Design a protein around this ligand. Structure first.
Ligand SMILES: [Mg+2]
Ligand SMILES: [Mg+2]
Ligand SMILES: [Mg+2]
Ligand SMILES: [Mg+2]
Ligand SMILES: [Mg+2]
Ligand SMILES: [Mg+2]
Ligand SMILES: [Mg+2]
Ligand SMILES: [Mg+2]
Ligand SMILES: [Mg+2]
Ligand SMILES: [Mg+2]
Ligand SMILES: [Mg+2]
Ligand SMILES: [Mg+2]
Ligand SMILES: [Mg+2]
Ligand SMILES: [Mg+2]
Ligand SMILES: [Mg+2]
Ligand SMILES: [Mg+2]
Lengths: 150, 98, 96, 79, 206, 127
RNA sequence: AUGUUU
RNA sequence: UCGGGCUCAUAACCCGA
RNA sequence: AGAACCUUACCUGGUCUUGACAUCCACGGAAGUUUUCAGAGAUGAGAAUGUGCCUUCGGGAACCGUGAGACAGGUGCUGCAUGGCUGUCGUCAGCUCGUGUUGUGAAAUGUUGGGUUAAGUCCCGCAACGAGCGCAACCCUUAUCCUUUGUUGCCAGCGGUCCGGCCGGGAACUCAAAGGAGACUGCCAGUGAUAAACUGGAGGAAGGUGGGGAUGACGUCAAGUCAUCAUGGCCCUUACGACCAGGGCUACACACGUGCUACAAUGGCGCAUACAAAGAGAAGCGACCUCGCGAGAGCAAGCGGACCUCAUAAAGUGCGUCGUAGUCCGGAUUGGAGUCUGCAACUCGACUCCAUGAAGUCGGAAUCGCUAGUAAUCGUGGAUCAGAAUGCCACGGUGAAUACGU
């Protein structure tokens, strides 16, 4: 409201070393079972290996690049009407937005295990396809189509 | 040997109590395990205040019951009653059996 | 509460201090496998208005058959009200 | 019904039922203990189970045992 | 209820109890009754005795007690007569031969219940609550008091609508733990109702 | 020498036995991985050692008591740090910089009489 | 919009 | 028409049948 | 915080009328005891037995029954007659008062204002000067370190060891728990009126009221409670009083609020396994071993408890597996059989056994909670309590996201 904060970081990657990566393990983590999150966010790259090849490190971020937006809109009421003024999202929440929408679809795959339900979307990005990547450009639709605002 | 389990709702009946309880038998000195603190059995009691409905209120309490061990090892018959007979206590409770 | 009720209950108490005070087992042993007849179990018409499970509490001070405290004997109103003054050794309002 | 080993019954009735069974029969026996397990000896006896207002004359067949006079007697109201 | 009991949360510090001894689920039960029973009969008679508090202890199979009366003389009577008579009441209403004694209370016009039971009677005595509480009650101030006050109840006088009068002197910050204030009440059954009393006597902080 | 390490946090309480040399750990008649290991990133025990090495340097054999999983091992962390002063009471200014000397002040929260769980309260539709 | 109730 | 929601409550409005 | 009886106020019926509960007067009888019959019981009428305390002998002390009244009894009505208690905005920062002064007055000022703060917080200014209630403190508790005490608690160097803190032993360690140490814009820099204060820093376990408790101003809603209890008035008086048995509060053709469990593979079931905190307890917790598929039943020790029993944490972990099926999910429902707590479980109890396996595949309009050890999830204990917790109270395990901005 009238106060300001910084950020709530935590223990990074268990070994591959990657602070932000933790989010992918947290954001996805449910019922506070991080002990299992590491069992999914890690085993995931162990499967994309043969899938992609090059360091799973890049593999992630690689396709991830085709999932992170860069411009959204925020409802702002004025004189009764509430415009949808656009706004370019900084990297901080950008990368986050992706992970959210990414892990989501993965849990909507509706197949069997998540380990695979996760890799699919992790690669579906680069090759382009899936619900996750969908939102990416889907957001672009609302974007600019309202450029008449901001 | 003789034990003396203490228990009171305050230190008043323990502080200046257990102490004298130790320097009573052994007017000069003796074995006796010696005084000790120990945990604290607490029984929290919660109750509803306002009569009729308003069960969302309540008021909790807790009877803090303190204790001490002590326990004498050498039953020096020359100091036994030097503690038992000298059983004042402003209404405490100290067990004694083996 | 209600004196008329309070007393009605008092009866339900004394009876235990009589029949159940001992004769309660005078038939109990003959109730569980301890061969073993049924006559006693049949002519079992001694404990009527008397039962170790028909006695209520009611705030000792007052007589409310609800909100009772074993460690005490009164109900929330009296207990709290009394504790406030100090008619109970070591009973300060709890607050961890 | 559920009485493990040795079902429960109210002597009050036992000293009224068979007490009047020996000598032929007569008028309906006004029961009252709906909590009593029906006896296979009180077979088709002319009685009546209290329903909180009056008593309903009911009889048991060679298929009702663990049941109590309460069962074969309504104590509420609906419809 | 906006303000709670200024005496309740005080048994810990700056304020002593009223029945310090010991008891478990077993004795505490019968014990809670005892302390009550006595204070009931004792008061009724010790009424005109000007009581302030009735402490109760228990060394072993017997109670101690400490009738805090502003004038134990009446409690004595024919020298021992009165006291003795009541000294038996406890031994019978306690179940065990209990001791006894008192400790006169000087400066009674600066004691909660004492002052409370004081202004509560004046009513039946046909007096003007206001002109009384703002005078024949605030007297404690005279005794170099630090702060005091009294808050009556409803049905004041011949009114048919309950209310509450103010009138107060000094400072009675019933929020300061160390402060320490003497609190008590008295339901002076009025000829036409049942008014209440609330005396706040704060004598020095900690 | 027989050093000591508090390592007592989050309802837990360990005992960092810092022996001379031998960077081996044996908490509760078992080694690190031979217990809580393989369940969490509990390997954070060497995290403090990541400033001056160990092994032949010192020993980190511990043994915790009471508390929860992540708590026990986690306690040792905040303990081992301060448990290295007997080797250099001036090297402490190299542990807190990575969250160590500071006891995990964060603990459970007393359930308040009136809330589902000392924070959250039931819904009120007809409100 | 009203409430002695668009 | 009815059942639910919206409001302090009505109508209106929204949902469902 | 606990409705089978009881509770229990409600009902159908049985029954009573100075009473179920009080004092008191008078009479007879110590009080009682166990039984008999008949009753649903409430009772009624008996059969024997028991023969207390004193007496300047009548009398009396309790007490039992009866007689008679003065009286007694009423969870009966007014919460607009009331006490006491509580909810409510609101943990809001407010609410006032004395003196002086301004105005005919009602009132105003202070308390407004400039900064600042979580804050009528602090400073500055000012016809204002001061003060009271309230926010800030002292109380608790947690985060550290020390002192002492070391048994039932502890186990490090020493040996012993049936290798079990199991022996001695050692008081080192965690721990326990009484007394303290500490945090205070206290210190450094900048900003800022060189004011307050703010923003970074050091040091420290801990920073800028450290975190969580408790604490709820003058008051408003004639807000709630005569049913806790108390009480003004009013009302009932072979009764709105009283006692007993059965029934009801556990209805249902519907509607709403708060909840519990799933719809599943971040899962289910089988294996083995990894670890907490706080409390409980003699008409109590009840180990151990035997039998039982099972609830549990038998035997019986230990502990009134840092000594024993409750206690065998659950998530978690590693394997068998099953493969997205309404199923290897989910568990309602129901049938037959049993256990127990109890006079007593049809009406109306908790659990177990086998059989049956529901709806339900994530939920419209709308709506709620939560800023961190929180939300979330997983277990544990307490209270009330004969015996029926998806509730309440409390404990810890693990353990997030997000916060531009009004
Ligand atoms: Mg009454
Ligand atoms: Mg009961
Ligand atoms: Mg928790
Ligand atoms: Mg109109
Ligand atoms: Mg009209
Ligand atoms: Mg009933
Ligand atoms: Mg009367
Ligand atoms: Mg009112
Ligand atoms: Mg009302
Ligand atoms: Mg009205
Ligand atoms: Mg101020
Ligand atoms: Mg405060
Ligand atoms: Mg009345
Ligand atoms: Mg009900
Ligand atoms: Mg229990
Ligand atoms: Mg329970």
């Amino acid at each position: 409201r009238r106060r300001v904060i910084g950020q709530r970081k935590i223990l990074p990657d268990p070994k591959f070393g990657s602070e932000l990566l933790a989010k992918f393990v947290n954001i996805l983590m449910v019922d506070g079972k991080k002990s299992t999150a590491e069992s999914i966010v890690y085993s995931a790259l162990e499967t994309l290996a043969q899938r992609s090849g090059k360091s799973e490190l890049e593999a992630f971020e690689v396709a991830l690049e085709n999932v992170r937006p860069t411009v959204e809109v925020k409802s702002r009421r004025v004189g009764g009407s509430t415009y949808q003024v656009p706004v370019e999202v900084r990297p901080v929440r950008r990368n986050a937005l992706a992970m959210r929408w990414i892990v989501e679809a993965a849990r909507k795959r509706g197949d069997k295990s998540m380990a695979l339900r996760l890799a699919n979307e992790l690669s579906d990005a680069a090759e382009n396809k899936g619900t996750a990547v969908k939102k990416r450009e889907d957001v672009h639709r609302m974007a600019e189509a309202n450029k008449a605002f901001a | 040997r003789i034990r003396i389990r203490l228990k009171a709702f305050d230190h008043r009946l323990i502080d200046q109590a257990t102490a004298e309880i130790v320097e009573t038998a052994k007017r000069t000195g003796a074995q006796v395990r010696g005084p000790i603190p120990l945990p604290t059995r607490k029984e929290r009691f919660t109750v509803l205040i306002s009569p009729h409905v308003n069960k969302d209120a309540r008021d909790q309490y807790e009877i803090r019951t303190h204790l001490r061990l002590v326990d004498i090892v050498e039953p020096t018959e020359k100091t036994v009653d030097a503690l038992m007979r000298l059983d004042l206590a402003a209404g405490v409770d100290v067990q004694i059996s083996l | 509460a209600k004196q008329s009720m309070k007393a009605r209950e008092v009866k339900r108490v004394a009876l235990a201090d009589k029949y159940f005070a001992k004769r309660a087992e005078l038939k109990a042993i003959i109730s569980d496998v301890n061969a073993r007849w049924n006559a006693v179990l049949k002519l079992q018409t001694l404990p009527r208005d008397s039962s170790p499970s028909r006695q209520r509490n009611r705030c000792r001070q007052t007589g409310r058959p609800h909100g009772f405290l074993r460690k005490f004997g009164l109900s929330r109103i009296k207990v709290r009200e009394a504790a406030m003054r100090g008619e109970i050794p070591g009973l300060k309002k709890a607050s961890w | 019904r559920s009485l493990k080993k040795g079902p429960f019954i109210d002597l009050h009735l036992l000293k009224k039922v068979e007490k009047a069974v020996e000598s032929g029969d007569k008028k309906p026996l006004r029961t009252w203990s709906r909590r009593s397990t029906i006896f296979p000896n009180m077979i088709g006896l002319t009685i009546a189970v209290h329903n909180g207002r009056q008593h309903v004359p009911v009889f048991v067949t060679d298929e009702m045992v663990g049941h109590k006079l309460g069962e074969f007697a309504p104590t509420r109201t609906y419809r | 209820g906006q303000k709670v009991h200024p005496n309740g949360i005080r048994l810990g510090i700056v304020k002593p109890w009223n029945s310090t001894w010991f008891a478990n689920t077993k004795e505490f039960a019968d014990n809670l009754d005892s302390d009550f029973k006595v204070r009931q009969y004792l008061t009724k008679e010790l009424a005109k005795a000007s009581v302030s508090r009735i402490v109760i202890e228990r060394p072993a199979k017997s109670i101690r007690v400490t009738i805090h009366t502003a004038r134990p003389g009446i409690v004595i009577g024919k020298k021992g007569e009165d006291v003795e008579k009541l000294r038996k009441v406890v031994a019978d209403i306690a179940g065990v031969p209990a001791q006894i004694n008192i400790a006169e209370v000087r400066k009674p016009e600066l004691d909660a219940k004492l002052v409370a039971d004081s202004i509560t009677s004046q009513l039946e005595r046909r007096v003007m609550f206001r002109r009384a509480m703002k005078r024949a009650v605030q007297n404690a101030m005279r005794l170099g008091a630090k702060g005091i006050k009294v808050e009556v109840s409803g049905r004041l006088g011949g009114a048919e609508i309950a209310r509450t009068e103010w009138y107060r002197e000094g400072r009675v910050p019933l929020h300061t733990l160390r402060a320490d204030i003497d609190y008590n009440t008295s339901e002076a059954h009025t000829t036409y109702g049942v008014i209440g009393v609330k005396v706040w006597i704060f004598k020095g902080e900690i | 020498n027989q050093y000591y390490g508090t390592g007592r946090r989050k309802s837990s309480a360990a005992r960092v036995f810092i022996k001379p040399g031998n960077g081996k750990i044996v908490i509760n008649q078992r080694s690190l991985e031979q217990y809580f290991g393989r369940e969490t990133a509990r390997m954070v025990v060497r995290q403090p050692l990541e400033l001056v090495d160990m092994v032949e340097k010192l020993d980190l054999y511990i043994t915790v008591k009471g508390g929860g999983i992540s708590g026990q091992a986690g306690a040792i962390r905040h303990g081992i740090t301060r448990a290295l002063m007997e080797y250099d009471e001036s090297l402490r200014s190299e542990l807190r910089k990575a969250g160590f000397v500071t006891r995990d002040a964060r603990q459970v929260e007393r359930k308040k009489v009136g809330l589902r769980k000392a924070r959250r309260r039931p819904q009120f539709s007809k409100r």
